[PDB]
Design a protein around this ligand. Structure first.
Ligand SMILES: O=C(Nc1ccc(Oc2ccc(Cl)cc2)c(Cl)c1)c1cc(I)cc(I)c1O
Ligand SMILES: O=C(Nc1ccc(Oc2ccc(Cl)cc2)c(Cl)c1)c1cc(I)cc(I)c1O
Ligand code: NA
Ligand code: NA
Ligand code: NA
Ligand code: NA
Lengths: 116, 114, 114, 116
């Protein structure tokens, strides 16, 4: 599991459950190729997106569908989504955890990068 | 204006208006003594807390009454308040902006020292 | 000034100066077309991006070149940039401030809509 | 484990390891009574602070010694510490996770509250 995503809800003080997450990788022609997708669990975590073999060097985009999350709670939020774009594995394989903290008009994102 | 406080509301996407803010300075007996007070304006800002002459080296605490702010909006908050504790003017006067971004179960605070 | 961007540096406690910012608007073919551009001032602010007449309903992307900012300081960053994507003026003109707080491995963004 | 603390470093993209954390509970005379303390592990997590029996209703303060953390890294930070003050267990026992994200001139804190 070299790529994990965790999402928290700053309004309710809870994991953000059932949030859709789409991962893309920049292709040779500069377009965003679909790479993996999933949804956060009851713990707010999304595991199993990829493998060490599949998760090669590249520029990756993680798009978290925060708009659908807020709308289901009856809230009209500001952002269309929360996105994280980063170069991965440039100095060799690493494990990446992307965390996002969500409010209707704000989000914060952080990465922890570890060397296995 | 060597010390300014700005408060924003991450739920409504607005300045946080009428938020009570108390500033304390640590005294020799390690007690917090009142130093300045006010409430945020319609822009979420609190100016005129102190003067350069009064704002000397020390440890300061800025206490933002976030609980009363959320209660006024009918929202149950987690924190009793948001406190920001820092050393100021330990190398002579400086200008300090303390910004706070509020959510019911989270807050962020940053300092801009110019 | 219906759209303003402010960028702060959480490592140095300062405005983030000379940060390149590009604004795009989503077109009918779902491509991002250039809409406005600039760089933050010495106060970390970018004003004068658009006018009320030009800033119509649409989906907008504000792309902040955070990587170049950290590289200029000799600091290795995580993100390629910070993007903020939002729908604006879908109920008529509004005023929008997008603030971003930057750290090498983290950023926060908030909108104040007045 | 009804009270857990997690601390992350936003400059390095890592857990904040060996960070001292002091917990206090407001006493009947309005003073802060020492309640528990510990330090974050190699994962940035501090477990085992208290028990269900010990962690009664009250107003609690969690003080995270961010100044010593930054100074050990050669950085002179802004804050003396990061503190979180909250009423706990008012509607019955809950589990609290307090997370803090640290930068030299900024910190963010969030709570997740769950009902066991
Ligand atoms: O933020 C993080 N971790 C976390 C985990 C659990 C937390 O609290 C609960 C409690 C119960 C439930 Cl069900 C869900 C969440 C909280 Cl507040 C925070 C986190 C962020 C990054 I970048 C990297 C790693 I590696 C992390 O671990
Ligand atoms: O965060 C800051 N500044 C800011 C200013 C304006 C903003 O947007 C509006 C728009 C209309 C209104 Cl009425 C209120 C707020 C937002 Cl969001 C943020 C800020 C934080 C620090 I540390 C230091 C300085 I120096 C700052 O400026
Ligand atoms: Na390489
Ligand atoms: Na000194
Ligand atoms: Na409309
Ligand atoms: Na009760």
């Amino acid at each position: 599991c070299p790529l994990m995503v965790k999402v928290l809800d700053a309004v309710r003080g809870s994991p953000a459950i059932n949030v859709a997450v789409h991962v893309f990788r920049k292709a040779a022609d500069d377009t965003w190729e679909p790479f993996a997708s999933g949804k956060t669990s009851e713990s707010g975590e999304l595991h199993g997106l990829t493998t060490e073999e599949e998760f090669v060097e590249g520029i990756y985009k993680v798009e978290i569908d925060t708009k659908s999350y807020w709308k289901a709670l009856g809230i009209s939020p500001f952002h269309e989504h929360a996105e994280v774009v980063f170069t991965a594995n440039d100095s060799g394989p690493r494990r990446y955890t992307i965390a996002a903290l969500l409010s209707p008009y704000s989000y914060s994102t952080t990465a922890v990068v570890t060397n296995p």
